[PDB]
Design an enzyme around this catalytic site. Structure first.
Site, PDB file in Angstrom:
ATOM      1  N   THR A   1       1.599   0.232   1.743  1.00 19.83           N
ATOM      2  CA  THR A   1       1.518  -0.282   3.133  1.00 19.83           C
ATOM      3  C   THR A   1       0.067  -0.655   3.358  1.00 19.83           C
ATOM      4  OG1 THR A   1       3.066   1.569   3.846  1.00 19.83           O
ATOM      5  CG2 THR A   1       2.296   0.055   5.602  1.00 19.83           C
ATOM      6  N   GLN A   2      -0.144  -1.920   3.699  1.00 22.76           N
ATOM      7  CA  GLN A   2      -1.441  -2.437   4.086  1.00 22.76           C
ATOM      8  C   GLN A   2      -1.290  -3.899   4.475  1.00 22.76           C
ATOM      9  OE1 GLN A   2      -3.781  -1.824  -0.020  1.00 22.76           O
ATOM     10  NE2 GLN A   2      -4.643  -3.588   1.104  1.00 22.76           N
TER      11      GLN A   2
ATOM     12  N   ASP I  91      -6.084   2.763   5.099  1.00 21.66           N
ATOM     13  CA  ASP I  91      -4.743   2.975   5.652  1.00 21.66           C
ATOM     14  C   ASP I  91      -4.795   3.959   6.802  1.00 21.66           C
ATOM     15  OD1 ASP I  91      -2.844   2.946   2.504  1.00 21.66           O
ATOM     16  OD2 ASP I  91      -3.762   1.323   3.679  1.00 21.66           O
TER      17      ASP I  91
END
Ligand code: L3T
Ligand code: MG
Ligand code: MG
Ligand code: MG
Ligand code: MG
Lengths: 233, 222, 212, 198, 222, 204, 196, 198, 196
Positions: A1-2, I91
């Protein structure tokens, strides 16, 4: 996730008779803000290889650090580090392609599209692409982002298949690249007027050109355009 | 789809490729994408194929009635205004993206229209999936005061860039030339650089290969 | 997929179809949905093909390992439980399998176990499994008797799979037939539905929904 | 899931319909008749959504009876089933569709033939030797494929259904509380009011 | 959200003869509506007279081929240079695929070679490791276009002896390499005509009891 | 649950030398359940043939609609509708429902009674005309049908040869699709006569 | 988009870049964002191209009908017609309009209508995605009663900064000059304004 | 839904459990014994999620049998149920909880009393004169609130149970295929093999 | 937030406003946004207050340990430690930092580390929500090798505009001057800078 934050648009490239050419503009975009203007997106490795990177700039800076570590590490306990055991384009490529694919497999990609350009020690041209998915391919012409949609069609009018490559001179290839950079500046909202260009020739070596500009732009026809349909004045 | 419009010094030309698709499958290998609005106003569309067609016929119909009513040759700005007001009223749901071109008593005209109902005026334009490959060629080679021959060549090269480089485009090049002087000339299959090579074998079957259960003669008249 | 197995007077009948599907696409018509674990043990396959193929092939390995360790063939109960316990480890991960383990041992007699990826394990006399299960059930249940001759029981098996092959879009191809005895499976051939349907229609006077 | 079965033999049509009415965790009724007579020689059976079911049937019933009295004539089963189809095909695209599946069993006196029509809530119509709606079809279609013959007597038809019911009482998850069976022939419609404990 | 998968196009086809096998694949590589390359092979000589293709998502395809070629290397090391037979290769590839059951390689894979008896063999896989030996198989994007053609032209399905009233099927025979190659070229020109992700080039690998042989044919480039 | 997939069904049409052919399968299903073995998908208004795949309720309804419309056409025009004209009628009738479309894939086949030349046409669900002169395909096995036709077809086949080609195209496409099959019918259409044939096929 | 209108000694000047984008693709590099709704009442459009074109057209029609019945409309009246359209249809519209006009009684005027459909009379206004980057600059450099040469330079400088930082802005710079004199169209090219 | 009933009379605990195993639209079996003997004087019945049900039961059975052999002694019913509750209470907060409800019926030899424990999958334990898991309790609790007496014999309890099964057969929407009845008293566990027509 | 750092003839200056908000509420009107991580290495923080403080604290720890072992860290070294923390943790971080430092060798230097964790060496940098409004102004008014007073004026003028347009900016303008001299803290109150 990014998600990419600061980004750099197309990297375009092609093979000619004696080597490879690669170019990328000097912009780091922040969404629709043209934030940074002196960004080098061409990375020489040794003097037979240029890595061109588009996508996330922080990830680009990480890949720079990796490529410099690779040169250091190859030189260790290696008396032929500047001769027969120097880093080859294919080695540099396979390495990055391994990294890219491992990172996507861990669900943590380097958010980039990369083109490795250079000449092998047997004189052979090397041109290959890898991206955030670990997808890899080779072609007489390679381009990322908008370049794939707009640069390739112009570049392919010059080198349409393998046998067009003995037939293509340095001058014609560079001319085609430079023209394609102009087209990109006309139509890509994230592109810049300033770009860098690198030639890797089996005879010349590495020619790295900085601070190039798009010239010979057509704008005069704008004055005749009035309104959006019916308006006359 | 790749469609282009190019203005030259005495008129305007439109060109299109001839492949239509159902997802990744080629449905028609040689469909005509150049539609007529009126004799000298022609039209190429991309997006929902049923929409570009229907909107072209509806406005073409109304244009004819308008022309009969007013005893005047149809104007391109009329097609434009009728098209954009119709499309706008439908808020994009009619997925018609069009390059409209023609000549009329006020001269030669080139416009694009988008599904939501916005229009732009240009000297050269492209639409469809192959739009970017076409524009690359246009931005490289267009100049002011093109001749009829140079404009036909430019438009054709731009459709070609679409055929080769865009997967949603292929087969042939259709052209239509509208000059301020004469009639419009519709030039069907102007180029045909994609002929299916001769097959390696015939697949004609020996008669009686297919098993039949029962047979009958079907009646038509009364 | 349609698979069935039933116990009767003269052992066990095992019958399966041979169609592989991926969505509405017919991937294969000639697939093997029975695994011959040993000369006395059979496994059937329904659901995810890979899941079935992989884990029942694995099951054969474990069964063989038992033979070397205990100097005796594994029971049906135990073989089924190995697969049952494996599948239970994976519960909720999305394994997809409907399975019958059918065999003979002296201690057990002829035995059928149903095992699925939910972890259910049942001993029974009659099972139909797969998207076509209900169709096979309709014919099987309405003509079943404990005392059916071997010949009739093999026919009922064959005919039940044909029924499901006919009605269920996701079943078809061919019928593969097995008989399991005290001695102990015997293969009773592959029967292509292309020929079998017309043959059965003619000889039986059934399938009157079908024109021609 | 409501069992709606139909079987067309040589001289009659037989409809078998489940008797249970279930809401939530309770069987509210064990003697429901999921059937409306449309005309002396046409019977309709229905299953589906709780309110839509009877409202549709009775609306169809009222309409056919109206036609009969206006023309002093009975519509053929084919004509009735086309009317029903069109009604459902209209309903499917309206603001709130009827969620109702039907079987229409009739004896056509002009042809002297029995007829069975299967129509689902979408307005999908088909004529069949035997039919079913819902889950029950998943058992009976294959069963009848095997045991059915085009030239059976009414008594043989009733034995065929006995097999169908029995199979459903063995394999269906829910208790449908037996079936009501009705026969449509040349004479009309009668009820075999002795099927459940036969 | 990051999508770890993509689609690179591409179609592959494998046919087994009596004492040979072929595995074919187009040389085009695509992303969305763009062409990445016109010549990027996806059929490989894997050593031991086995050829392989894994078509779909190219990155998973290459990962798998790489991993299998590495199996072959290590099989030689660990089992004294023993030849890895085709049935053993198939089984091995199942474990490679099923090892990633919960994060699969998005490829349809086909291998071709010769069995123990020297008969041509073709094995094909789903993404997660399910496999079967077959006389022929098409995989990838135009698979649904080509498979039915192969049922008809390799296994003679739906073809009867004329005059027998469809009671005697057309007898199955092995095809020659010349006839197989014809069907391959015809299958690919057909697939090229009707599928937008198929074209550019055709590379065929032929396997016999003397090694692996290659042939290349231009395909349509639109 | 996608409406073009609930029932199953294929239709293909082909031109040959002074003739057309149009063929369909007979299956009417509901998901996995085969329901009827006799559901024909080809209709005819005079010498004009219409094949319709997709949601079966709409197939029935479209046939009843085009029967209606072509009857009225015949009454006012005092002649039968021609294929080129009917194609336009199908197209504009489907476009009339642009925002609540019939879920169908109609196919037109026939010979023009005046010019004598073979005519086929295809449509998408909102009436876009596919104007191919070689072949037109429709239904859940369309991919397979495209592959069979492109490979098997050649121009100018005699009626008796065209029968074999279209039959083999249909049969082999149907056998690679779960929701098609269960029988097929082939119409061979010649100006002068029409032959209807029922094919023998796999019943699974 | 970068748009602006500036009142000055002799009237008002409107200015705009010429870039239209869909995503990152420049759909039109030579767009004309300066829209005439009456002889000396012009507007600038930002937001949905469809919505602002449909609005400008309805306004053009309304003012033509006005002129036929009642003489030239005032700039305020033109702004009021835009506002009625934008306010009443606010839910269905993405329209940001700057109205500018010359009038003999009133001289130069500028009205801005942002998204909601409120109206604001201002000495000068700036709008579009590009305008965020030049609030500081414009607030620091605007003076009332500038000369024609001064206002052109103020608009030239402001828009070139907007173009430099906004990717959705670019191309040529267009201006319309609205005074008693008449209507003057100006254009400035990249090689000119990039140097500043 | 899976019927699981227990009733404690004066000298025994009676467990009754439905015999159907249903997956989807098919009854796969109609003779399923939803029970494990934990020790000679303790019986456990169970219902819930498909795999969990038997796995939990067998795991518990293994553990009690292990205790018995290690100690050469039988745990009291109270102790077994405490151990069962603990296992369920741990399960509910783990990665994948056992979705199993159980009844425990034991004869305590040290006290000379029958004992009935009801435990849900959360580890909620209660000792009750009678209990049920699932929807069945929505009928039986009120019925037994009326009919149950604390001094009933085993034969009186079997009649009380017959009444419960009749009601469920009458009102429950699912065909649960009758019950297997087991009696736990001083002389151990036995199955009443005649109930489907007693 | 409006934050900036500017190199000049004798070194580097950092400036910031003093407003911190949660929604439209000013939680702190006198915040000190200028953070020292070594004697002559300072930074401005933007984004999550929790994140940027935790980061600045870790960097300060690394630079103190660095100084114990190896001597004064360069400004580049400081910037690299920030990047490492920002890149590697991209993140769970919302942090934009500007690093400014002085040493005798390299003179005055500025690095900016925006959201992604990239590093950029620049003659001057601007960040925070308020900066968007002054891109035009800063580009037009910045020159290299300005004097102390000129630079103080440039930051004062720039931030006053950023404050004027950004609701999330305001209060007092704080500055830190970094030269050989010397570390000098400056402050400017609204009554001064609003009148500019
Ligand atoms: C039990 C059995 C054993 C052996 C042979 C047949 C059978 C009958 N079973 C089936 O046919 C099932 C039906 C089913 C589909 C989806 N769900 C649950 C069940 N099909 C599959 O499991 C297919 C098999 C397949 O296509 N094999 C290829 C081969 C061996 C036929 C050439 N794989 C697939 O569809 C498949 O792998 C996938 C399809 N799309 C995917 C995207 C990502 C990952 C995997 C897949
Ligand atoms: Mg081997
Ligand atoms: Mg192609
Ligand atoms: Mg079937
Ligand atoms: Mg403020």
């Amino acid at each position: 996730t990014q998600q990419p934050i600061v980004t750099g648009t197309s990297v375009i490239s092609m093979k000619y008779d004696n080597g490879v050419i690669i170019a990328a503009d000097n912009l780091g975009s922040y969404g629709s803000l043209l934030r940074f203007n002196g960004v080098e997106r061409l990375i020489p490795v040794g003097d037979n290889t240029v890595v061109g990177i588009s996508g996330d700039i922080s990830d680009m800076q990480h890949i720079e650090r990796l490529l410099k570590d690779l040169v250091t590490e190859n030189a260790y306990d290696n008396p032929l580090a500047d001769a027969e055991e120097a880093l080859e384009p294919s080695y540099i490529f396979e390495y990055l392609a391994t990294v890219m694919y491992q990172r996507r497999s861990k669900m943590n990609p380097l958010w980039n599209a990369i083109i490795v350009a250079g000449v092998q020690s047997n004189g052979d041209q090397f041109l290959r692409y890898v991206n955030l998915l670990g997808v890899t391919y080779s072609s007489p012409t390679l381009a990322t982002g908008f370049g794939a949609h707009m640069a390739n069609p112009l570049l392919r009018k010059v080198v349409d298949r393998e046998s067009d490559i003995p037939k293509t001179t340095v001058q014609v290839a560079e001319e085609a690249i430079v023209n394609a950079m102009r087209v990109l500046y006309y139509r890509d909202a994230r592109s810049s007027r300033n770009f860098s260009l690198a030639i890797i020739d089996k005879n010349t070596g590495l020619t790295f050109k900085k601070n190039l500009q798009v010239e010979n732009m057509k704008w005069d026809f704008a004055k005749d355009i009035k309104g959006y349909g019916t308006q006359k004045i | 789809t790749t469609i282009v419009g190019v203005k030259f010094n005495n008129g305007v030309v439109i060109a299109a490729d001839t492949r239509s698709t159902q997802g990744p499958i080629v449905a028609d290998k040689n469909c005509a994408k150049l539609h007529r609005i009126s004799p000298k106003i022609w039209c190429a569309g991309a997006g929902t194929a049923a929409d570009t067609e229907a909107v072209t016929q509806l406005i073409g119909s109304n244009i004819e009635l308008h022309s009969l009513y007013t005893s005047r040759e149809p104007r391109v700005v009329s097609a434009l205004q009728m098209l954009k007001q119709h499309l706008f009223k439908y808020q994009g749901h009619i997925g018609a993206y069009l390059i409209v071109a023609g000549v009329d008593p006020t001269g030669s005209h080139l416009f694009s229209i988008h599904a939501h109902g916005s229009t732009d005026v240009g000297y050269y334009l492209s639409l469809g999936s192959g739009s970017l490959a076409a524009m690359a060629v246009l931005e490289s080679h267009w100049k002011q005061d093109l001749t009829k021959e140079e404009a036909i060549k430019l438009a054709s090269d731009a459709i070609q860039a679409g055929i080769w480089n865009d997967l949603g485009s292929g087969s042939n090049v259709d052209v239509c030339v509208m000059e301020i002087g004469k009639d419009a000339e519709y030039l069907r299959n102007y180029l045909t650089p994609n002929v299916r090579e001769e097959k390696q074998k015939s697949y004609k079957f020996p008669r009686g290969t297919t098993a039949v259960l029962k047979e009958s003669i079907v009646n038509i008249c009364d | 997929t349609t698979t069935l197995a039933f116990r009767f007077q003269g052992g066990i009948i095992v019958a399966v179809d041979s169609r592989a599907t991926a969505g509405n696409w017919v991937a294969s018509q000639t697939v093997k949905k029975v695994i011959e674990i040993n000369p006395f043990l059979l496994g059937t396959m329904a659901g995810g093909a890979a899941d079935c193929q992989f884990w029942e092939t694995w099951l054969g390995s474990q069964c063989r390992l038992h033979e070397l360790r205990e100097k005796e063939r594994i029971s049906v109960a135990a073989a089924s439980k190995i697969l049952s316990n494996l599948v239970y480890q994976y519960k909720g991960a999305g394994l997809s399998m409907g399975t019958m383990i059918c065999g003979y041992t002296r201690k057990e007699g002829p035995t059928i176990y149903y095992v699925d990826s939910d972890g259910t394990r049942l001993k029974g006399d009659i099972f139909c499994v797969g998207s076509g299960q209900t169709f096979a059930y309709g014919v099987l249940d309405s003509n079943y008797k404990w005392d059916l001759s071997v010949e009739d029981a093999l026919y009922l098996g064959k005919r039940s799979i044909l029924a499901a092959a006919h009605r269920d879009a996701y079943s078809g191809g061919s019928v593969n037939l097995y008989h399991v005895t005290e001695d102990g499976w015997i293969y009773h051939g592959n029967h292509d539905v292309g020929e079998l349907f017309w043959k059965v229609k003619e000889e039986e006077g059934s399938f009157n929904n079908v024109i021609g | 899931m409501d069992i709606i079965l139909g079987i067309r033999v040589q001289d009659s049509v037989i409809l078998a319909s489940s008797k249970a009415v279930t809401r939530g965790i309770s069987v509210l009724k064990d003697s429901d008749d999921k059937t409306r007579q449309l005309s002396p020689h046409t019977l309709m059976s229905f299953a589906g959504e709780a309110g839509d079911t009877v409202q549709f049937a009775e609306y169809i019933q009222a309409n056919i009876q109206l036609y009969s009295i206006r023309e002093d004539y009975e519509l053929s089963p084919q004509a009735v089933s086309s009317f029903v189809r069109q009604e459902l095909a209209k309903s499917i695209r309206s603001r709130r569709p009827y969620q109702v599946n039907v079987l229409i069993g009739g004896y056509d006196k002009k042809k002297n033939k029995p007829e069975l029509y299967q129509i689902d809530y979408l307005g999908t119509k088909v004529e069949l030797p035997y039919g079913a709606h819902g889950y029950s079809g998943f058992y009976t279609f294959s069963l009848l494929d095997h045991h059915y013959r085009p030239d059976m007597t009414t008594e043989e038809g009733l034995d065929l259904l006995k097999l169908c019911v029995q199979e459903l009482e063995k394999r269906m998850p829910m208790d449908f509380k037996g079936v009501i069976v009705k026969i449509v022939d040349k004479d009309g419609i009668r009820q075999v009011d002795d099927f459940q404990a036969q | 959200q990051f999508n770890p998968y993509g689609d690179n196009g591409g179609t592959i086809l494998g046919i087994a003869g009596e004492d040979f096998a072929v595995l074919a694949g187009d040389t085009r590589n695509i992303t969305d509506y763009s062409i990445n390359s016109r010549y990027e092979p996806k059929v490989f000589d894997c050593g031991d007279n086995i050829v392989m293709s894994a078509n779909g998502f190219a990155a998973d395809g290459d990962a798998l081929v790489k991993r299998f070629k590495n199996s072959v290397k290590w099989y030689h090391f660990d089992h004294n240079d023993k030849k890895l037979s085709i049935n053993s290769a198939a089984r091995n590839i199942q474990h490679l695929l099923y090892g990633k059951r919960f994060f699969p390689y998005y490829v349809h894979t086909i291998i071709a070679g010769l069995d123990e008896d020297g008969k041509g063999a073709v094995y094909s896989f789903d993404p997660v490791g399910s496999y079967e030996r077959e006389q022929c198989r098409a995989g990838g994007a135009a698979a649904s276009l080509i498979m039915p053609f192969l049922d008809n032209q390799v296994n003679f399905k739906n073809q009867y002896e004329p005059g027998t009233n469809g009671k005697v099927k057309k007898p199955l025979k092995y095809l020659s390499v010349e006839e197989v190659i014809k069907l391959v070229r015809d299958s690919f020109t057909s697939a090229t005509e009707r599928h937008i992700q198929v074209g550019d080039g055709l590379e065929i690998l032929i396997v016999t009891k003397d090694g692996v042989r290659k042939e290349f044919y231009e395909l349509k480039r639109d | 649950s996608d409406p073009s997939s609930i029932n199953g069904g294929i239709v293909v049409a082909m031109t040959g030398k002074d003739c057309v052919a149009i063929a369909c399968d007979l299956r009417l299903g509901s998901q996995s359940l085969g329901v009827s073995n006799k559901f024909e998908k080809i209709f005819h208004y005079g010498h004009v043939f219409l094949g319709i795949t997709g949601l079966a309720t709409d197939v029935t309804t479209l046939n009843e609609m085009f029967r209606y419309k072509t009857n009225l056409y015949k009454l006012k025009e005092e002649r039968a509708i021609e294929p080129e004209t009917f194609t336009q009628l199908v197209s504009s009738s489907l476009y009339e429902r642009r925002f609540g479309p019939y879920f169908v894939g109609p196919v037109v086949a026939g010979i023009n009674s005046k010019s004598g030349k073979p005519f086929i046409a295809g449509f998408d669900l909102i009436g876009c005309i596919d104007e191919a002169k070689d072949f037109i395909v429709s239904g859940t096995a369309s991919d397979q049908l495209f592959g069979m036709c492109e490979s098997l077809y050649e121009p100018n086949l005699e009626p008796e040869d065209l029968f074999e080609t279209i039959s083999q195209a249909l049969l082999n496409a149907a056998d690679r699709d779960a929701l098609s099959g269960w029988g097929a019918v082939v119409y061979i259409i010649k100006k002068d006569e029409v032959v209807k044939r029922y094919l023998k096929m796999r019943q699974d | 988009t970068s748009i602006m209108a500036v009142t000055f000694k002799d009237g008002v000047i409107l200015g705009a870049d010429s870039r239209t984008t869909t995503g990152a693709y420049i759909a039109n590099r030579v767009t004309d964002k300066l829209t005439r709704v009456h002889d000396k009442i012009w507007c600038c459009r930002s937001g949905s191209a469809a919505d602002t074109q449909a609005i400008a057209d309805i306004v053009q029609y309304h003012l033509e009908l006005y002129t036929s019945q009642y003489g030239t409309p005032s700039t305020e009246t033109a702004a009021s017609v835009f506002k009625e359209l934008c306010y009443e249809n606010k839910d269905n519209l993405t329209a940001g309009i700057i109205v500018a006009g010359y009038d003999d009684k009133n001289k130069g005027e500028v009205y801005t209508i942002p998204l909601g459909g409120s109206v604001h009379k201002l000495p000068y206004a700036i709008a579009g995605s590009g305008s965020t980057f030049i609030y500081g600059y414009c607030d620091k450099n605007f003076r009332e009663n500038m000369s024609k040469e001064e206002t052109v330079d103020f608009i030239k400088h402001s828009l070139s900064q907007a173009i430099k930082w906004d990717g959705s802005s670019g191309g040529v710079i267009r201006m319309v000059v609205l005074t008693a004199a008449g209507v003057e169209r100006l254009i400035f090219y990249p090689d000119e304004y990039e140097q500043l």
